[PDB]
Design an enzyme around this catalytic site. Structure first.
Site, PDB file in Angstrom:
ATOM      1  N   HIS A  77       0.809  -1.240   0.000  1.00  0.00           N
ATOM      2  CA  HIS A  77       0.000   0.000   0.000  1.00  0.00           C
ATOM      3  C   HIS A  77       0.830   1.273   0.000  1.00  0.00           C
ATOM      4  CE1 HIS A  77      -4.269  -1.673   1.085  1.00  0.00           C
ATOM      5  NE2 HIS A  77      -3.650  -2.358   0.146  1.00  0.00           N
ATOM      6  N   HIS A 244      -1.022 -12.539  -2.140  1.00  0.00           N
ATOM      7  CA  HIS A 244      -2.142 -13.338  -1.547  1.00  0.00           C
ATOM      8  C   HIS A 244      -1.753 -14.800  -1.278  1.00  0.00           C
ATOM      9  CE1 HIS A 244      -5.282  -9.981  -2.534  1.00  0.00           C
ATOM     10  NE2 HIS A 244      -4.309  -9.571  -1.714  1.00  0.00           N
TER      11      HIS A 244
HETATM   12  C1  HEM Z   1      -6.410  -6.610  -7.287  1.00  0.00           C
HETATM   13  C2  HEM Z   1      -5.436  -6.160  -6.492  1.00  0.00           C
HETATM   14  C3  HEM Z   1      -5.564  -6.384  -5.016  1.00  0.00           C
HETATM   15  C4  HEM Z   1      -6.690  -6.411  -4.219  1.00  0.00           C
HETATM   16  C5  HEM Z   1      -8.101  -6.010  -4.553  1.00  0.00           C
HETATM   17  C6  HEM Z   1      -6.322  -6.817  -2.880  1.00  0.00           C
HETATM   18  C7  HEM Z   1      -7.210  -6.836  -1.801  1.00  0.00           C
HETATM   19  C8  HEM Z   1      -6.951  -7.196  -0.494  1.00  0.00           C
HETATM   20  C9  HEM Z   1      -7.865  -7.102   0.584  1.00  0.00           C
HETATM   21  C10 HEM Z   1      -9.280  -6.568   0.572  1.00  0.00           C
HETATM   22  C11 HEM Z   1      -7.195  -7.555   1.695  1.00  0.00           C
HETATM   23  C12 HEM Z   1      -7.759  -7.669   3.094  1.00  0.00           C
HETATM   24  C13 HEM Z   1      -7.457  -6.494   4.018  1.00  0.00           C
HETATM   25  C14 HEM Z   1      -7.901  -6.937   5.425  1.00  0.00           C
HETATM   26  O1  HEM Z   1      -9.141  -7.066   5.721  1.00  0.00           O
HETATM   27  O2  HEM Z   1      -7.015  -7.199   6.307  1.00  0.00           O
HETATM   28  C15 HEM Z   1      -5.853  -7.901   1.269  1.00  0.00           C
HETATM   29  C16 HEM Z   1      -4.878  -8.517   2.026  1.00  0.00           C
HETATM   30  C17 HEM Z   1      -3.554  -8.727   1.567  1.00  0.00           C
HETATM   31  N1  HEM Z   1      -3.065  -8.338   0.377  1.00  0.00           N
HETATM   32 FE1  HEM Z   1      -4.013  -7.683  -1.170  1.00  0.00          FE
HETATM   33  N2  HEM Z   1      -5.002  -7.046  -2.850  1.00  0.00           N
HETATM   34  C18 HEM Z   1      -4.510  -6.837  -4.112  1.00  0.00           C
HETATM   35  C19 HEM Z   1      -3.204  -6.931  -4.504  1.00  0.00           C
HETATM   36  C20 HEM Z   1      -2.158  -7.244  -3.614  1.00  0.00           C
HETATM   37  C21 HEM Z   1      -0.751  -7.145  -3.919  1.00  0.00           C
HETATM   38  C22 HEM Z   1      -0.327  -6.649  -5.237  1.00  0.00           C
HETATM   39  C23 HEM Z   1      -0.015  -7.510  -2.735  1.00  0.00           C
HETATM   40  C24 HEM Z   1       1.434  -7.686  -2.506  1.00  0.00           C
HETATM   41  C25 HEM Z   1       2.276  -8.057  -3.457  1.00  0.00           C
HETATM   42  C26 HEM Z   1      -1.026  -7.845  -1.746  1.00  0.00           C
HETATM   43  C27 HEM Z   1      -0.792  -8.411  -0.489  1.00  0.00           C
HETATM   44  C28 HEM Z   1      -1.731  -8.684   0.451  1.00  0.00           C
HETATM   45  C29 HEM Z   1      -1.388  -9.306   1.727  1.00  0.00           C
HETATM   46  C30 HEM Z   1      -0.064  -9.810   2.202  1.00  0.00           C
HETATM   47  C31 HEM Z   1      -2.537  -9.339   2.439  1.00  0.00           C
HETATM   48  C32 HEM Z   1      -2.711  -9.892   3.806  1.00  0.00           C
HETATM   49  C33 HEM Z   1      -2.653  -8.896   4.977  1.00  0.00           C
HETATM   50  C34 HEM Z   1      -2.648  -9.557   6.333  1.00  0.00           C
HETATM   51  O3  HEM Z   1      -2.272 -10.755   6.473  1.00  0.00           O
HETATM   52  O4  HEM Z   1      -3.074  -8.930   7.342  1.00  0.00           O
HETATM   53  N3  HEM Z   1      -2.250  -7.674  -2.324  1.00  0.00           N
HETATM   54  N4  HEM Z   1      -5.745  -7.680  -0.075  1.00  0.00           N
HETATM   55  O   LIG Z   2      -3.605  -5.796  -0.521  1.00  0.00           O
END
Ligand code: HEM
Ligand SMILES: [O]
Ligand code: HEM
Ligand code: NA
Ligand code: NA
Ligand SMILES: [O]
Lengths: 713, 713
Positions: A77, A244
């Site tokens: 982010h 993810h």
């Molecule tokens: C279409 C693009 C993307 C969407 C819509 C998306 C959406 C989301 C959402 C809604 C969450 C949940 C937030 C929460 O309730 O804690 C999340 C978690 C996460 N996203 Fe994404 N994401 C995207 C791309 C990415 C990218 C590009 C990365 C890193 C390379 C990333 C890494 C993560 C990680 C590591 C989590 C987990 C956070 C945790 O464990 O607390 N995401 N994402």
């Molecule tokens: O994310």
């Protein structure tokens, strides 16, 4: 308190040019962050970060005992605000800790992530910036969970106030498209320069477009927003699937339990936000996005389980406990671990936008290749993660520390190393006299050097005269650059270079990049001379010439100036008034209001206008460096009126005789209208200002010529 | 473009502390206005101004062929924004040429007056500021028309952007009282710090209160507004009657004919506004206020006709051609000349607010005495004009040029000239050792010197430690100053002084004013020593002690701090949150955000809080100069909640045990909540910052000690 903004909400805002003064910075004006960073024991910082990953704090307990996922999202982010259109946003200034980004809904609970890093920030002090720490922490999270990163560069200096960025015109967080301030028009055309689908989101809505859980339509938004963040289909899939692979989302109860974002919260919350009345408000009960998805069977370890689950199951539309749309694997076993209770397990789940990677036909091919070949997936994700988190760092010369990757990447707009002695002051004098003896005019020399240097933008530190890319596609063909005139200037300069270089010993030679800049310096000196002033314009050699093969022509497209007030140029008709576009260009050039004013007034009378337009050329001695622009603009003996043909062009007529004296655009006349700009014009237009005008002009010309010169930093 | 202000309109605004940076100023940071003014040929400027008075321009023809009246009103309005409550407004920064004041309705057509001065401003350049020019032009207008001024001082440096001033909360220009943002409550109580009855007016409404033409009620508003501009009944009558001896009002046709104010007008208007469609839109057809009044039979000459007409006729309520209320003399002949047409003559006319000078009983007695004794009227108006136009210039040492009046006036808070050798560095060392051997504590010495120095405000340059007025009524009695403790410190200091002075030769002596400051420096030095640092605090001698008779006790009332965050002091409950009041006080002290932060953190741990309150005293080594305030504030091991008894006091409890560790106010906690302030606190709270904190603290302490030291400037 009723402000000037409230009274005159459409008046031009100059404050954006006067941010980042030494007044707001708590470091000495001598502080050099690069030197502080170079002495940081980066190994020790990473060992502390490593320990932090599994040291849960009870005020925000670690999912699965591991903060890695949370920190990856934080660093993602921090980087993911970046837009190619203007280079604004990105991780490079640590802006996530300030308003508005700290309080965007998409950044919910990253306040907790940042706070967990305070003890390490405190321990290391000024030797590591927040901006660098956020990215590093992301890298350490990845490494701690078994993923080999491509590298890491320090050097992101901290900033001390919010950047002024246009994030959209909506007055309601996350407003769905089609409202009175819709960022969409036509067939879902996202307005430039924006790179997210809703106000307060990083890229797309994880439920789908405007909340509609269709993965095929979501894929469209993904593709568009990621392209606008410099990522192609391969990089996009790699990033989303890579990210993810780790951690989980948080939606354990209704969203109505979540209180005020950080900037709205009470003072006692000490800069935290989203305080939740749902059960313990944290840990097993956490609510962040409202989604409740855990993607892999080992959320704290790198694996290729994201694609095994994506393709290994069929998916059914469901709802989180907070009511959000999400997907669950049909007939699966409970194989996914619970983040807190070792006796519970869950079925695999996915977001709409995850499913895009399978149901979009072009993504599906790449996702299948990454599924079948997880080593290709790992390498693509590593490269993309490096690019993403360093995209706004600027030239390689700014990269610090012992983890900088040695591979030079095309996206970096690389500049070859210099392998020969540089010209000296006497060589610079000889080259300036030769340039001027060739018959190139002041107008040609100034216009060419301006065209080459003024591609720089301080937002992502791309562009500038280093590289001599003005001679390559696409710059050589940009309309603002006057392609035919440019070609004839470059041919003459290249003949001068070839003769100078052929005559040298010891392998001394001059780059075309340097000579373009030097030749403009000669133009400015000559213009001063034409006015009766003897000045030496400073010049620093050391640029090198990049090749066509070292220049990504598509990436270079976003640097084309469609508006350049300094050349009185507008490529087409825009919704934003021209004077607003001028101040936007000045900000990108790192100019203050006085520097913008001097520079524009001087360029007008030097002949820098595209197409030799007479607009704003308020002088009878064109190609002499004088303050004539200001003296004539401010002369009340002239009356100005918009033309019948074009309300954006004005005629200046003698008040007594009605005789036509001049014409100007909005960009010209704003310096006689706006009350702060007119105060500046008055200084330069006064009887005692000719010498000051010349000196100040030379200083700002030199500043623009050196904007990309991080090799001299 | 949706901004942080739109999202979080109640968040603290720190930009006010980072105004007037060198970024926005077009002069070098080396530019010294006083030195440039010293070389101005003031005589030549005045000769040009005299010429200007009757050089009518066709784009704004001069009434009666003479612009004197217009220019008097211009100068009057430049000065007349001044408020004693905070010292903001006034002529001293030439803010009439910027938003919003350039476009207030009360400043209508003063854009024309300023534009008439452009050629003179241009000719003389940086050697006369706009700010000085506006007042000087007023003076020359008075002299041109036969009135001898008391004097004139240069030295008002021009500023380059709008000052951030609270002018009221109303969202409609000239809103009548009792609206949703009413500046009035109760028995017509005007809210502090305001000094005008309606948004966009200088003082009162010339038709009467909220447009009601009752001269007795108007008199009440006049008395209250003018008191808030430092003017008593004698000065008020002298000013109004003096001013309205000259020129005329403008109301030749309906106000609907008048267009956009300068900040709303089209770019082609080149900074001007109120373009009128009534007939020729100017001269005989001019519309400014909408009133149509000419007060005297000789509007371009000093006369005693104002009072002859006021008392010589009975007055009848009537309407101007724009429909405004005004008064005409019952059965008078047409004795007043027309401004353009020698064949027309008019009856005497007056405003409601002019009639106040007769129908208010206290004004009536003064007005009769001025009518019977025109010499007294002349001298009172000359003195008042000088005071009005110089009220915000600060100490006499800033007055420049050859027309400065030699007479020292009480309103100037005068400081006696120093007539003896000053203490040297050896003497300063001996005095600090004696101070420390006396047994006065760090807390006492710091609190006393802070109390003395922190009265300064940069808005009108009143206050500060020079003069030792802390020992006099009323400062000695102010609650924030802790009168009993103050008296004990001053008694011990006075004994030290008397013994030091008794022992000297050659007439060397130290003032109490100097000693108070030097003693505070010793306190800071001792505090540093208590923390294990070896520090010398800079000290500049040269203050002198003013007497009681040289200190107007009523005028000194407005410098009483009812809010001083630096001592965690609030005298009562206010509508403005405490942290807003802190930033307000920091601005008046000329501090940047980092300076405010360091200073406040250090004062907390030195024992500067009024009443020895523990609020924000986040240290276990009180009276030692450390960064403990920051380290403890930022400690996430503590959770903060407002107390039940008082929502403005907070308790900080251990997160694990629930044990009470500290208490704090909003002024304390804001440094841990606001995202820019917390970024500053983090720098000083870091493990590498203890030395930096000490040095930065000393720098800012010294800055505050020297704020009023224009004798050294
Ligand atoms: C279409 C693009 C993307 C969407 C819509 C998306 C959406 C989301 C959402 C809604 C969450 C949940 C937030 C929460 O309730 O804690 C999340 C978690 C996460 N996203 Fe994404 N994401 C995207 C791309 C990415 C990218 C590009 C990365 C890193 C390379 C990333 C890494 C993560 C990680 C590591 C989590 C987990 C956070 C945790 O464990 O607390 N995401 N994402
Ligand atoms: O994310
Ligand atoms: C009760 C306080 C005052 C009120 C309500 C008041 C009101 C006005 C108004 C409404 C005008 C007419 C503006 C126009 O239509 O052109 C005016 C003109 C003027 N006022 Fe005042 N005034 C006040 C005090 C002062 C003072 C203190 C001075 C100077 C010492 C002054 C000097 C002038 C002069 C010289 C003009 C004539 C302008 C011209 O000839 O163009 N007034 N005043
Ligand atoms: Na950027
Ligand atoms: Na002031
Ligand atoms: O006035």
């Amino acid at each position: 308190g009723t402000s000037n903004r409230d009274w005159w909400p459409n008046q031009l805002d100059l404050s954006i040019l006067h941010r980042h003064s030494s007044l707001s910075d708590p470091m000495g004006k001598d502080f050099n962050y690069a030197q502080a960073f170079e002495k940081l024991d980066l190994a020790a910082v990473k060992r502390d970060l490593h320990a932090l990953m599994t040291t849960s704090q009870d005020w925000w307990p670690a999912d699965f005992g591991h903060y890695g996922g949370l920190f990856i999202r934080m660093a993602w982010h921090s980087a993911g605000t970046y837009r190619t259109a203007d280079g604004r946003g990105g991780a490079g200034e640590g802006q996530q800790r300030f308003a508005p980004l700290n309080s965007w809904p998409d950044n919910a609970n990253l306040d907790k992530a940042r706070r967990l890093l305070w003890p390490i920030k405190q321990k290391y002090g000024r030797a590591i910036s927040w901006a660098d720490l956020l990215i590093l922490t992301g890298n350490v999270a990845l490494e701690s969970m078994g993923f080999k990163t491509f590298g890491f560069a320090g050097g992101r200096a901290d900033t001390w106030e919010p950047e002024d960025v246009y994030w959209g015109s909506e007055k309601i967080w996350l407003e769905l498209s089609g409202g009175p301030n819709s960022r969409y028009s036509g067939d879902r055309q996202l307005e430039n320069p924006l790179a997210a689908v809703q106000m307060g989101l990083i890229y797309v809505n994880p439920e789908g477009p405007d909340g509609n859980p269709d993965p095929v339509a979501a894929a469209r938004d993904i593709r568009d927003t990621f392209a606008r963040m410099a990522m192609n289909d391969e990089e996009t899939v790699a990033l989303i699937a890579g990210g993810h692979t780790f951690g989980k989302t948080h939606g354990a109860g209704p969203a109505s339990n979540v209180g005020a974002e950080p900037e709205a919260a009470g003072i006692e919350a000490q800069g935290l936000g989203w305080k939740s009345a749902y059960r313990t408000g944290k840990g097993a009960d956490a609510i962040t996005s409202g989604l409740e998805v855990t993607w892999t069977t080992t959320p704290t370890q790198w694996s290729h389980n994201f694609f095994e689950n994506l393709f290994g199951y069929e998916w059914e539309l469901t709802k989180s406990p907070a009511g959000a749309h999400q997907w669950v694997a049909k007939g699966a076993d409970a194989v996914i671990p619970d983040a807190f209770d070792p006796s519970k397990k869950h079925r695999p789940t996915m977001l709409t936008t995850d499913l895009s990677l399978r149901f979009d036909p072009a993504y599906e091919k790449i996702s299948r290749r990454f599924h079948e070949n997880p080593e290709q997936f790992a390498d693509a994700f590593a490269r993309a993660w490096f690019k993403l988190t360093h995209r706004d760092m600027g030239p390689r010369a700014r990269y610090l520390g012992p983890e900088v990757p040695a591979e030079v990447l095309l996206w970096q707009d690389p500049i070859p190393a210099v392998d020969h002695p540089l010209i000296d002051a006497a060589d610079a004098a000889e080259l300036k006299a030769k340039v001027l003896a060739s018959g190139l005019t002041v107008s040609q020399l100034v216009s060419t050097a301006w065209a080459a240097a003024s591609t720089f933008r301080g937002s992502d530190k791309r562009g500038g005269a280093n590289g001599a890319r003005i001679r390559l596609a696409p710059q050589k063909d940009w309309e603002a650059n006057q392609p035919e005139q440019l070609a004839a200037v470059l041919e003459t300069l290249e003949a001068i270079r070839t003769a100078f270089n052929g005559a040298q010993r010891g392998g001394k030679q001059v780059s075309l990049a340097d000579l373009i800049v030097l030749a403009g310096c000669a133009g400015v000196e000559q213009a001063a001379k034409n006015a009766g002033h003897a000045v030496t314009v400073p010049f620093a050699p050391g640029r090198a010439d990049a090749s066509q093969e070292q220049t990504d022509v598509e990436s270079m497209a976003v640097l084309e100036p469609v508006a350049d007030g300094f050349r009185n140029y507008l490529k087409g008709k825009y919704r934003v008034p021209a004077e607003v576009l001028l101040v936007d260009k000045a900000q990108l050039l790192t100019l203050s209001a006085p520097e913008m004013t001097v520079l524009l007034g001087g360029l007008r009378v030097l002949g820098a206008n595209v197409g030799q337009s007479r607009h704003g050329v308020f002088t009878a001695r064109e190609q002499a460096l004088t303050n004539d622009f200001f003296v004539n603009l401010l002369d009340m003996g002239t009356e100005w009126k918009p033309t019948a043909a074009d309300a954006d062009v004005f005629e200046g007529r003698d008040r007594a005789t009605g005789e036509l004296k001049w014409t100007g655009t909005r960009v010209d006349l704003v310096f006689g209208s706006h009350s702060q700009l007119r105060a500046l014009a008055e200084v330069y237009g006064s009887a005692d200002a000719q010498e000051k005008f010349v000196r100040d002009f030379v200083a700002v010309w030199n500043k623009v010529m050196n904007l990309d010169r991080f090799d001299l930093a």
